[PDB]
C-alpha cells in the first residue's frame, strides 16, 4: 500500500498543541518525525512528543465490546453491547429523571467528541451533570481568571512573550512540563529579557532566570499582596489604565495594605520584594506565566501595572492536558452549553432549544466530577465514564471503588483495559489520538488539526461514531453527523465565536485562535484587545486576604 | 554520457520540463529509472501544503514525480536516516534519491557504517547555495520584505539574493543583509563548503547555464559510471535531452563554486571566534548545554548517531532522573561524532531547547579535519578511530618531537 | 586546603610493571597520583578520560608500552590515536589540555616513573584547580 507515508498530527501530551509527522508504513504507525512548517513548535518535540507513536499498536488495546455476564467479561457484538446501553439507560431515566444519570469525559478527547457527548447528555435526557477531567487536574483557576477579565483562558500566546522586557515565571516547572512553552523563555533568556522566577524550589526553569526567590509553600497571596502594597505605595500603577478599564481599586487598597512587612508569612526579604515589585512595575510590557484565589491575585497584579491588552504583556496560566481548553470551549461543564454560554439565562437556553430541536433544557447547575461521585448511590446511578481512570486518579481510590460499585450499570469506553473497567457493566472499546479525525484546542486558544494515521486496531470505533450509534438506538433526533467536520458545523452553527474556525481554515499550519466570530476573522491571538469581557466591559480586580492552612 | 562530462540537459516532456526550478533534468531522470525498473522506488521531496512544507516522499507510481518536481528551499530535512529507519536501510530494493551536499556526505556516513546499501541507492546530487527554516522565511517575508507570507507563490536564493515572486511583482534582498539582520540561510548553511556533490552519481545545478538557456537547461555533471548508464539511457529512451556545456560556462561554475567556499569560510571563522576562548568557551558550553532536558532528538537525527542504545543512556555515564543533566552528555557526543561531522545542522534545529549543538560540533570537526586530515563523507573512508596505523601512529608521535603526548601538538 | 587530584590508568604489563618497580627500587615520590591498573591501553575508552574530567579530575594521565612494545601487538597505537583526540577536544572546549598526557614507561623504567610522578604533580599545582568544579554549581 504505502511505505513511509507522512501525517502531521497535534501531540496528544499536554496543551502546548506541537505538531508532528507520524510516520505510516503498511497501515502501521511506525515512528514520529519532526514537522519544521509547525508555527507552535518549529519541529522541536519533548521526550513525550518524540515517543507519542509507542503504544498506539500495543496488543492491550481493546479490541471488541465487553460484557460484564456474572463474573469475568465476555467478548460481545456492537448491536449486542449497544442495544444493552440503550436499554439500561432508558430504565434509569424512566425512572429517576435528569439527576439520576452522570456523564463525564477525559481532557484527552477531541473536540467533535466533547461536543457530541455534552449533545448526547443534554438534548437526550435533559440532565447537566456532564463534566470533565479539568476539576480534579490541578487548576480551578479558571473561574478566578473568569471573574477577574471575562474569559478564563490564557489573554496572550506563546510566542507573544517574546516581545516583553519581564517574563515573571511564576511558581512554574515550566520546562518539566510544557518544554516548548519553556522554550520561549529560552529564546527570551538568549535575546536578553529580564526573567523572574518565583517558585519554591529551585527548578530547571528557574535556572534560566536572572533573578530566582524562594519563598513558603503556599503563600502566594502573601507574597503578590506585599508586591501590590509596595506597586501601590511608590505609586507604580497605571493611572489611566487602572481609571478607564478597572474597577474595584479601593478595596484593593484596603486589602494590601496590611501586607507591608509579610516576611513571617513568606520567606522573601523585604529587599528582594522591593526589587522584585519595582522591576515588574517599571517594565514597559511585562508577562506573567502561571502554573481560584491564587489566580485572582495574578489578575490583581496585571490589571494594577496595566499589562493586559496588548503585545508582548498578560498572563498565561499553562494547562497541562492535550485538549482541557477544548473540553471546556465546547461545553463538557455543567453550567456552560458551549464557548462559555451559560445555562442560567433564558437567551442562549431557548437558542439552544431552536437550534437542537428539543424542549426544557435543565438550566440547573449540573454535578461536578466529585458532587457526582459523592452522591454515586444516593440520587445518582448509572454513568458513563468517556476516557477516565477514577480509581486510579481520584484521591481516596478505594472510596471511589466503594462507590463505583455502590452503581447500578456504569459505562465504561476506552482504548485499554484499565482498573476502573473491572467495575464497568459494558466497556466499548474507543480509537486513540492516532485514528481519530478530530481537532485540538491549545492552551492558547489555537484549534489544530488531528489527522487519521491509521485505523482503529479490530473492531474499535471512534467516539463520535459509537454516541452516534447509541443516540439512533435510543431515538434522539439530531446525531446524524457521519464526520468530524459536520459534527464541527453543527457546534460552529451553535456558538457565536468560533463560528469562523471552518476546517478549510483549519488546514493552514496556523491554527485559529479561539474568539473568531466570522469568517474572515483571523482570530484573536491576544484577548482584551481594548475592552474585557465582564459586565461593564471592565476588569474588576479583588482583595483576597491570605489564609493560613 | 561518461564520468566526467558536463552537459545541458532538460527534459523533452514540457510539463516536466515548466515544472522544474531549471529544465526537469532531476525530475526526467528520476521518472526514467522508475519507468524502466532501474529502481523499485524514489525518494523525494514534495510540497505538502504551502511551498513553506517540505514533505519526503517514496514514489512508486511513475505518474507521481511530476508532484515532486520543483526546488524546495525551505526543505531543511535529511533523507539518508529516513531510508535506514523506515526503509529497511535500502538492503533489499533499489532505489533514486535527490539530495543536497549535506544528503550526499550522510549517505556516506552511513554507508561507512554499514547502516545503508550503497550499491542499492542511486544518488542524484542538486547543488546547495543554502536552505532556510520556514517558520523564519515567514518571518522574514512578513517583516523584512513586507509581504504576506500566504502570497508567496515561489521563493528561491539566486546571485546571493532572496527572489520572492507574490501577486503584484518580485523582490529581492541580499542573503548577506539578511544574514547580518538576524535571518538568511540557517548557520550550518552559512558555515557550509559542500556545493557541488562530486561524490554523488549527477550533480545537478542551475550554475553554469547561460545565454539562450538561463532558465530551461539544468547543468549536469556525471560523476560516475553509474551516472553515465543512468543519463546515456535516459537520452536514448528520449526522456532527456543532452548537449555539451558551455566552456565559459563550466569556468563560471567554478568561480561561483569558489567564492562559495570563501563566503563559508569566513563564516566559519566568525562563527567559532565568536564562541570563545579558553575557560570562556567553558562557561559558554557549560551554560548552554545546562538546559538540556534529554530530549535526544539530536542523537535519533544525527547521521552519525548509529548505536542501538546511546551510551547517553546508560546509567553509568548519565543518572537516569536528574534532569539538569551533567555535561557528559554532550561530551560523550563530542567523543563519538566530532572526528566525522557532516554539518548537516539537524541536531541545532530538531532542540526544544535552543542550544547550538552543530555549532559546537562543527568547531570541534573543523580542527580534528586539520589534524588528522580526514574529510567527513567524501568516500568510503573508514573512521579515523576504526582504522589506526602503525606507521601514521609513529609519525604523529615523532612530529611531536617528544617522547608522550604532552606538548608541541598545537600551533 | 586544596591538594591535586590526579588519576592515572596504567596498562598491566609495562606501566604497573614500572610502577612496581620504582616502589621495589625505593624511589620516592609524591602521594599525588591514584592508578586504575588496565590490561592494554588500548582498553582506555575515551569516555573514560571525559568521565574523569567532568567528575573533576584536576589531572588525568595514562601510560602504557613504547610504541613497538605492547603486550598485545598494537593495543598503544589505538590508544595514542585516542588521547591525540581528546587533547583537540579539551582544548575546543576550552580546558586546559595540558591537564592531559600519555607517557610510554617500560617495565624497567622505575626512575622514569617517579620522574613522569613527580612532573605530573608540578604541572597539576602550577594549572591550579579544574574549572569544571566551580562552572557546574
Ligand atoms: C534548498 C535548495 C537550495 C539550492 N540552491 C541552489 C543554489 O544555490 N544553486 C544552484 O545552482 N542550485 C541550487 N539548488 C538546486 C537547483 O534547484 C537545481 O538547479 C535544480 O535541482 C535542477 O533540477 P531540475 O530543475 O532539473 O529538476 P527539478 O524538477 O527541479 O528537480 C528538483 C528535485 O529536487 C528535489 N528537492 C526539492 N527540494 C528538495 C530539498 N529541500 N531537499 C532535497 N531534494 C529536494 C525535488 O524533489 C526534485 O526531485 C538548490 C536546491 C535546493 C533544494
Ligand atoms: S511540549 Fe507538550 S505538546 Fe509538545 S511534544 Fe511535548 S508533551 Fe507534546
Ligand atoms: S548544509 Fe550545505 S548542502 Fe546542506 S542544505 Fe545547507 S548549504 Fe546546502
Ligand atoms: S536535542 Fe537539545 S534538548 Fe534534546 S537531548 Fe539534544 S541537546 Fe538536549
Ligand atoms: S552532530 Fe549535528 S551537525 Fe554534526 S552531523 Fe550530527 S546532526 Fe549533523
Ligand atoms: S552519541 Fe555515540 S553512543 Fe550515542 S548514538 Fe551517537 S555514536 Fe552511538
Ligand atoms: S600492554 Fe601496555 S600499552 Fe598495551
Not at chain 1, 536578553?192 to 518565583?198: D, L, N, R, S, T
Request: with cysteine.
Amino acid at each position: 500500500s504505502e511505505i513511509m507515508k507522512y501525517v502531521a498530527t497535534t501531540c496528544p501530551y499536554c496543551g502546548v498543541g506541537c505538531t508532528l509527522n507520524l510516520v505510516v508504513s503498511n497501515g502501521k504507525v511506525v515512528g514520529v518525525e519532526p514537522n519544521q512548517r509547525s508555527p507552535i513548535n518549529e519541529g522541536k518535540l519533548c521526550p513525550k512528543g518524540v515517543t507519542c507513536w509507542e503504544h498506539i499498536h500495543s496488543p492491550d488495546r481493546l479490541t471488541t465490546p465487553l460484557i460484564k455476564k456474572d463474573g469475568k467479561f465476555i467478548e460481545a457484538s456492537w448491536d449486542e453491547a449497544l442495544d444493552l446501553v440503550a436499554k439500561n439507560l432508558k430504565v434509569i431515566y424512566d425512572k429517576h429523571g435528569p439527576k439520576g444519570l452522570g456523564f463525564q469525559t477525559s481532557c484527552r478527547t477531541v473536540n467533535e467528541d466533547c461536543y457530541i457527548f455534552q449533545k448526547f447528555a443534554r438534548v437526550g435526557f435533559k440532565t447537566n451533570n456532564v463534566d470533565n477531567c479539568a476539576r480534579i487536574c490541578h487548576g480551578p483557576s479558571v473561574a478566578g481568571l473568569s471573574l477577574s477579565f471575562g474569559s478564563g483562558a490564557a489573554t496572550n500566546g506563546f510566542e507573544d512573550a517574546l516581545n516583553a522586557d519581564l517574563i515573571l515565571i511564576w511558581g512554574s516547572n515550566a520546562v518539566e512540563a510544557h518544554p516548548l512553552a519553556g522554550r520561549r523563555i529560552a529564546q527570551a533568556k538568549k535575546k536578553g529579557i529580564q526573567i523572574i522566577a518565583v517558585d519554591p524550589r529551585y527548578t530547571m526553569t528557574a535556572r534560566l532566570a536572572d533573578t530566582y526567590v524562594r519563598f513558603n509553600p503556599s503563600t502566594h497571596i502573601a507574597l503578590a499582596n506585599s508586591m501590590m502594597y509596595w506597586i501601590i505605595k511608590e505609586g507604580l500603577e497605571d493611572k489611566k489604565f487602572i481609571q478607564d478599564r478597572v474597577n474595584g481599586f479601593e478595596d484593593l487598597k484596603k486589602t494590601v495594605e496590611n501586607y507591608a512587612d509579610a516576611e513571617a508569612i513568606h520567606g522573601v526579604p523585604l529587599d528582594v520584594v522591593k526589587d522584585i515589585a519595582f522591576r515588574y512595575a517599571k517594565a514597559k510590557n511585562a508577562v506573567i506565566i502561571y502554573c481560584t484565589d491564587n489566580v485572582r491575585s495574578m489578575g490583581n497584579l496585571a490589571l494594577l501595572t496595566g499589562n493586559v491588552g496588548r503585545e508582548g504583556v498578560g498572563v498565561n496560566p499553562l494547562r497541562g492536558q492535550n485538549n482541557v481548553q477544548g473540553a471546556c470551549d465546547m461545553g463538557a461543564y455543567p453550567n456552560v452549553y458551549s464557548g462559555y454560554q451559560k445555562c442560567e439565562v433564558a437567551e442562549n437556553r431557548a437558542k439552544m432549544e431552536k437550534a437542537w430541536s428539543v424542549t426544557n433544557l435543565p438550566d440547573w447547575y449540573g454535578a461536578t466530577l466529585t458532587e457526582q461521585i459523592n452522591q454515586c448511590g444516593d440520587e445518582i446511578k448509572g454513568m458513563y465514564i468517556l476516557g477516565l481512570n477514577p480509581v486510579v486518579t481520584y484521591p481516596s481510590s478505594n472510596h471511589v471503588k466503594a462507590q463505583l460499585e455502590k452503581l447500578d450499570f456504569l459505562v465504561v469506553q476506552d482504548i485499554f483495559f484499565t482498573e476502573t473497567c473491572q467495575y464497568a457493566d459494558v466497556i466499548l472499546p474507543g480509537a486513540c489520538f492516532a485514528e481519530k479525525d478530530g481537532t485540538f484546542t491549545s492552551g492558547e486558544r489555537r484549534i489544530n488539526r488531528v489527522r487519521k494515521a491509521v485505523n482503529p486496531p479490530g473492531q474499535a470505533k471512534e467516539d463520535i461514531h459509537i454516541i452516534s450509534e447509541l443516540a439512533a438506538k435510543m431515538g434522539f433526533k439530531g446525531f446524524e453527523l457521519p464526520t468530524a467536520k459536520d459534527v464541527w458545523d453543527d457546534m460552529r452553527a451553535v456558538t457565536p465565536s468560533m463560528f469562523g474556525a471552518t476546517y478549510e481554515k483549519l488546514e493552514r499550519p496556523e491554527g485559529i485562535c479561539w474568539p473568531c466570530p466570522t469568517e474572515e476573522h483571523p482570530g484573536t491571538p491576544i484577548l482584551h484587545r481594548e475592552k474585557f469581557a465582564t459586565a461593564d466591559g471592565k476588569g474588576n480586580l479583588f482583595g483576597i486576604d491570605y489564609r493560613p492552612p | 554520457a561518461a564520468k566526467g562530462d558536463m552537459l545541458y540537459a532538460w527534459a523533452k516532456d514540457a510539463e516536466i520540463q515548466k515544472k522544474g526550478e531549471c529544465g526537469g533534468a532531476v525530475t526526467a531522470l528520476l521518472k526514467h529509472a522508475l519507468e524502466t525498473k532501474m529502481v523499485d522506488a524514489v525518494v523525494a521531496i514534495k510540497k505538502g501544503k504551502d511551498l513553506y512544507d517540505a514533505v519526503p516522499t517514496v514514489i512508486t507510481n511513475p505518474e507521481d514525480i511530476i508532484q515532486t518536481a520543483g526546488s524546495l528551499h525551505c526543505g531543511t530535512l535529511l533523507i539518508p536516516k529516513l531510508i535506514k529507519k523506515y526503509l529497511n536501510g535500502a538492503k533489499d530494493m533499489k532505489l533514486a534519491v535527490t539530495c543536497k551536499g549535506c544528503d550526499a556526505m550522510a549517505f556516506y556516513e552511513l554507508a561507512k557504517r554499514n547502516q545503508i546499501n550503497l550499491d542499492n541507492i542511486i544518488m542524484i546530487g542538486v547543488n546547495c547555495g543554502g536552505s532556510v527554516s520556514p517558520v523564519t522565511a515567514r518571518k522574514m517575508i512578513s517583516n523584512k520584505f513586507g509581504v504576506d507570507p500566504d502570497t508567496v507563490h515561489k521563493e528561491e536564493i539566486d546571485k546571493g539574493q532572496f527572489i520572492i515572486e507574490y501577486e503584484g511583482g518580485h523582490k529581492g534582498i541580499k542573503i548577506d543583509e539578511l544574514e547580518e539582520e538576524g535571518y538568511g540561510r540557517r548557520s550550518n548553511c552559512r558555515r557550509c563548503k559542500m556545493k557541488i556533490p562530486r561524490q554523488a552519481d549527477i550533480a545537478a545545478g542551475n550554475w553554469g547555464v547561460i545565454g539562450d538557456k538561463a532558465g530551461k537547461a539544468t547543468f549536469l555533471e556525471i560523476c560516475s559510471e553509474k551516472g553515465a548508464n543512468l543519463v546515456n539511457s535516459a537520452q536514448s529512451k528520449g526522456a532527456l535531452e543532452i548537449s555539451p556545456a558551455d566552456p565559459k560556462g563550466i569556468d563560471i561554475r567554478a568561480k561561483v563554486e569558489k567564492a562559495m567556499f570563501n563566503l563559508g569560510d569566513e563564516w566559519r571563522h566568525r562563527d567559532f571566534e565568536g564562541m570563545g576562548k579558553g575557560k570562556d568557551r567553558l562557561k559558554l558550553m557549560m551554560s548552554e548545554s545546562s538546559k538540556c532536558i534529554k530530549c535526544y532528538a539530536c542523537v535519533e537525527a544525527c547521521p552519525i548517531c548509529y548505536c542501538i542504545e546511546c551510551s547517553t543512556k546508560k546509567p553509568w555515564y548519565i543518572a537516569p532522573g536528574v534532569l539538569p543533566t551533567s555535561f557528559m552528555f554532550h561530551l560523550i557526543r563530542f567523543a563519538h561524532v566530532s572526528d566525522s561531522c557532516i554539518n548537516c545542522g539537524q541536531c541545532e534545529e530538531l532542540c526544544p531547547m535552543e542550544i547550538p549543538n552543530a555549532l559546537f560540533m562543527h568547531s570541534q570537526q573543523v580542527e580534528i579535519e586539520k589534524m588528522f586530515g580526514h574529510i567527513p563523507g567524501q568516500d568510503m573512508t573508514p573512521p579515523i578511530h576504526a582504522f589506526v596505523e602503525e606507521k601514521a601512529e609513529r609519525a604523529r608521535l615523532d612530529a611531536t618531537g617528544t617522547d608522550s603526548i604532552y606538548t608541541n601538538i598545537f600551533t | 586546603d586544596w591538594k591535586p587530584q590526579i588519576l592515572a590508568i596504567i596498562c598491566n604489563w609495562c606501566s604497573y610493571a614500572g610502577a612496581d618497580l620504582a616502589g621495589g627500587a625505593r624511589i620516592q615520590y609524591p602521594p599525588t597520583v591514584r592508578a586504575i591498573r588496565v590490561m592494554c591501553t588500548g582498553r582506555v575508552d575515551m569516555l573514560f578520560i571525559l568521565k574523569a574530567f567532568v567528575e573533576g579530575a584536576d589531572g588525568v594521565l595514562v601510560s602504557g608500552c613504547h610504541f613497538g612494545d605492547c603486550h598485545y601487538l598494537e593495543g598503544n597505537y589505538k590508544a595514542a590515536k585516542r588521547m591525540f583526540m581528546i587533547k583537540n577536544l579539551l582544548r575546543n572546549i576550552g580546558l586546559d589540555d595540558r591537564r592531559f598526557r600519555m607517557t610510554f614507561v617500560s617495565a624497567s623504567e622505575g626512575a622514569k616513573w617517579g620522574m613522569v610522578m613527580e612532573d605530573v604533580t608540578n604541572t597539576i599545582k602550577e594549572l591550579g584547580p579544574s574549572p569544571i568544579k566551580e562552572f557546574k554549581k
